[PDB]
Structure 1
């Protein structure tokens, strides 16, 4: 039923690993008093009160799973 067209000939381009450049420490903790990316209740919204809830949350001031994208080799254009 699906189409999702198609691709090119069976010949793939090159890939290199140089991950020492990607190894750098950028310290960014997560504050819960600032509420940095925490799940909302799905259908139970409140107003002006403090409420306890059991769900899925991370810890406070954590490090993360740091990755970063970059650009490839080039010369001129």
Structure 2
């Protein structure tokens, strides 16, 4: 197997604070076919103007 770097020597993991309300936000971005949002080109072949 491959080891990129030595394991961390830190005695304890850093303290983390979790607050759901501050993170929560209201933003709307619906997918648009006209804008070709989230669309993957066919890997098999390229296509012309048709």
What band does the TM-score fall into relative to the shorter chain? 0.7 to 0.9
Distance 1:43 1:18, change over 3 A: same
Where do 5+ consecutive residues of structure 1 fail to align? 49-77
How many residues align? The count is 48
In the TM superposition, 1:57-76 aligns within 5 A as: none
Which protein has the bigger helix share? Answer: 2
Runs (4+) off by over 6 Å: none
* TM-aligned CA deviation for residue 38 of structure 1: 1.0
Q: TM-score, normalised by structure 1?
A: 0.52
